[PDB]
Write an enzyme that holds these catalytic residues in place. Structure first.
Site, PDB file in Angstrom:
ATOM      1  N   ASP A 185      -1.202   5.448  -5.607  1.00 36.07           N
ATOM      2  CA  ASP A 185      -1.697   4.614  -4.507  1.00 36.07           C
ATOM      3  C   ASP A 185      -2.037   3.185  -4.944  1.00 36.07           C
ATOM      4  O   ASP A 185      -3.085   2.961  -5.537  1.00 36.07           O
ATOM      5  CB  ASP A 185      -2.923   5.288  -3.896  1.00 36.07           C
ATOM      6  N   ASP A 198       0.814  -1.214   0.000  1.00 40.60           N
ATOM      7  CA  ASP A 198       0.000   0.000   0.000  1.00 40.60           C
ATOM      8  C   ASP A 198       0.854   1.273   0.000  1.00 40.60           C
ATOM      9  O   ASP A 198       1.349   1.709   1.057  1.00 40.60           O
ATOM     10  CB  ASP A 198      -0.972  -0.036   1.198  1.00 40.60           C
TER      11      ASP A 198
HETATM   12  C1  LIG Z   1      -7.809   5.953   2.266  1.00 36.86           C
HETATM   13  C2  LIG Z   1      -8.465   4.586   2.050  1.00 36.86           C
HETATM   14  F1  LIG Z   1      -9.056   4.640   0.863  1.00 36.86           F
HETATM   15  F2  LIG Z   1      -9.365   4.349   2.994  1.00 36.86           F
HETATM   16  C3  LIG Z   1      -7.493   3.401   2.017  1.00 36.86           C
HETATM   17  O1  LIG Z   1      -6.537   3.601   0.968  1.00 36.86           O
HETATM   18  C4  LIG Z   1      -5.223   3.012   1.098  1.00 36.86           C
HETATM   19  N1  LIG Z   1      -4.330   3.376   0.174  1.00 36.86           N
HETATM   20  N2  LIG Z   1      -4.944   2.184   2.035  1.00 36.86           N
HETATM   21  C5  LIG Z   1      -5.871   1.803   3.113  1.00 36.86           C
HETATM   22  C6  LIG Z   1      -5.073   1.558   4.382  1.00 36.86           C
HETATM   23  C7  LIG Z   1      -6.665   0.553   2.747  1.00 36.86           C
HETATM   24  C8  LIG Z   1      -6.575  -0.002   1.472  1.00 36.86           C
HETATM   25  C9  LIG Z   1      -7.304  -1.124   1.087  1.00 36.86           C
HETATM   26  N3  LIG Z   1      -7.099  -1.563  -0.190  1.00 36.86           N
HETATM   27  C10 LIG Z   1      -7.720  -2.537  -0.866  1.00 36.86           C
HETATM   28  O2  LIG Z   1      -8.508  -3.312  -0.364  1.00 36.86           O
HETATM   29  C11 LIG Z   1      -7.419  -2.669  -2.332  1.00 36.86           C
HETATM   30  C12 LIG Z   1      -8.233  -3.442  -3.176  1.00 36.86           C
HETATM   31  N4  LIG Z   1      -7.909  -3.526  -4.487  1.00 36.86           N
HETATM   32  C13 LIG Z   1      -6.818  -2.853  -4.990  1.00 36.86           C
HETATM   33  O3  LIG Z   1      -6.468  -2.908  -6.307  1.00 36.86           O
HETATM   34  C14 LIG Z   1      -7.116  -3.781  -7.237  1.00 36.86           C
HETATM   35  F3  LIG Z   1      -6.812  -5.090  -6.932  1.00 36.86           F
HETATM   36  C15 LIG Z   1      -6.020  -2.087  -4.142  1.00 36.86           C
HETATM   37  N5  LIG Z   1      -6.332  -2.019  -2.837  1.00 36.86           N
HETATM   38  C16 LIG Z   1      -8.154  -1.746   2.009  1.00 36.86           C
HETATM   39  C17 LIG Z   1      -8.322  -1.244   3.301  1.00 36.86           C
HETATM   40  C18 LIG Z   1      -7.608  -0.121   3.701  1.00 36.86           C
HETATM   41  F4  LIG Z   1      -7.775   0.349   4.938  1.00 36.86           F
HETATM   42  C19 LIG Z   1      -6.862   2.946   3.335  1.00 36.86           C
HETATM   43  F5  LIG Z   1      -6.163   3.994   3.876  1.00 36.86           F
END
Ligand SMILES: CC(F)(F)[C@H]1OC(N)=N[C@](C)(c2cc(NC(=O)c3cnc(OCF)cn3)ccc2F)[C@H]1F
Length: 381
Positions: A224, A36
């Site tokens: 991100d 992440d």
């Molecule tokens: C600000 C925000 F949107 F809430 C989140 O964004 C990021 N970058 N990380 C966090 C820690 C997070 C990220 C995820 N990410 C995913 O589940 C995910 C799913 N698919 C993705 O790409 C396609 F496969 C990427 N990330 C899940 C729970 C989470 F808590 C949060 F801070």
């Protein structure tokens, strides 16, 4: 330039993110950890939440040290709460090192872990400024660089596609030249908190949106890996969708589809990719008045939804959406590209990903240089 051990060290499922195997504690406890670049805590499930395959058991680790401090992390959707400590951490399919890292042992959470996913924690790769509770909690990558001779950079190749399997590579401390074609092009990291960058121009099928470029970065633009969508500021989204609608006039779709309120399905392998336009973001270059262009296909922004029980057809979600937090270059962008987070040189490199999904007519692209004036005025203060 060739980090064979780290190639293909990422796994995941569509819409559930990309995780890397890590070990924590002595003896090593194996965990799958979401990569992440949009957060800065190393935070791992540490209690038997029923969605979790496994979790960090602090009592089993002889190298665990308690920091006697909790942390409460609310999001827009979910939350997690954890207890801070340090322990020895390593990446089996990463550099041959062991570091003492901060770990937030997650003890309560809501709408955080994904039911049916195969990861149990999150590796926040961004900078200390956005670490919780404050910037004194040194992020994992900072500890890794401080404690070892691993160079201050990592690169990500995120490869998109029963939920289908995704994969890719996280090259820690370097670049693997087999993961991309053509040249890398670099954009400055504007500030070390998120991986902040400046979008300078937007085009839909080569047609400029003609907006004041400050709108593109209101109030920031970030890279991100922990976000699925290309997220755009409200006004930019409106203009982009208007233009995408115009370019794909050959077919009509309901309003709800463009708003991600509704899926659109087509019959078995008959997707009209060709009616949907390419999307191009021009990023600030390394030198005054110079920019470059990254271009993604509908294959990036029209994402398959595999788990639709009520349909027998091929269903897709429009994965460009509106945002109050600025532009977010999520998986929709990153799946097109090999992305180099060159922390040492405060810059981010983009190159055509060797694994990106395309067709025989169109490919994702990274092109330059272009002459772009007043690129500083594009940043928001
Ligand atoms: C600000 C925000 F949107 F809430 C989140 O964004 C990021 N970058 N990380 C966090 C820690 C997070 C990220 C995820 N990410 C995913 O589940 C995910 C799913 N698919 C993705 O790409 C396609 F496969 C990427 N990330 C899940 C729970 C989470 F808590 C949060 F801070």
């Amino acid at each position: 330039g060739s980090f064979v051990e780290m190639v293909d060290n990422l796994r995941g499922k569509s819409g559930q993110g990309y995780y890397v195997e890590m070990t924590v504690g002595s003896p090593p406890q194996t965990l799958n950890i979401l990569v992440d670049t949009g957060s800065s805590n190393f935070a791992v499930g540490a209690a038997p939440h029923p969605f979790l395959h496994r979790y960090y058991q602090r009592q089993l680790s002889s190298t665990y040290r308690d920091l006697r401090k909790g942390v409460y992390v609310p999001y827009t959707q979910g939350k997690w709460e954890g207890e801070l400590g340090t322990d020895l951490v390593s990446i089996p399919h990463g550099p041959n090192v062991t570091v003492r890292a901060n770990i937030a042992a997650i003890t309560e959470s809501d709408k955080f872990f994904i039911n049916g996913s195969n990861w149990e924690g999150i590796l926040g790769l961004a900078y200390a400024e956005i670490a919780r509770p404050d910037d004194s909690l040194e992020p994992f990558f900072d500890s890794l660089v401080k404690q070892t001779h691993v160079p201050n950079l990592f690169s990500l190749q995120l490869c998109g596609a029963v939920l289908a399997s995704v994969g890719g590579s996280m090259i820690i401390g370097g670049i693997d030249h087999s993961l991309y074609t053509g040249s890398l092009w670099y954009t400055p990291i504007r500030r070390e908190w998120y991986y902040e960058v400046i979008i300078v121009r937007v085009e839909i099928n080569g047609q400029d949106l003609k907006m004041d470029c400050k709108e593109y970065n209101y109030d920031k633009s970030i890279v991100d890996s922990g976000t699925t969508n290309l997220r755009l500021p409200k006004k930019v989204f409106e203009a982009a969708v208007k233009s995408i609608k115009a370019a794909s006039s050959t077919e009509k779709f309901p309003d709800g589809f463009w708003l991600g309120e509704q899926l659109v399905c087509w019959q078995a392998g008959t997707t009209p990719w060709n009616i949907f336009p390419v999307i191009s973001l021009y990023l600030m270059g390394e030198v005054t008045n110079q920019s470059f262009r990254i271009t993604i296909l509908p294959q990036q922004y029209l994402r398959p939804v595999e788990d639709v029980a009520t349909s027998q057809d091929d269903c897709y979600k429009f994965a460009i959406s509106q945002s109050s937090t600025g532009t977010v270059m999520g998986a929709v962008i990153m799946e097109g590209f090999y992305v180099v987070f060159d922390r040492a040189r405060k810059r981010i490199g983009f190159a055509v990903s060797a694994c990106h999904v395309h067709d025989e007519f169109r490919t994702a692209a990274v092109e330059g240089p272009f002459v772009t004036l007043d690129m500083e005025d594009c940043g928001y203060n």
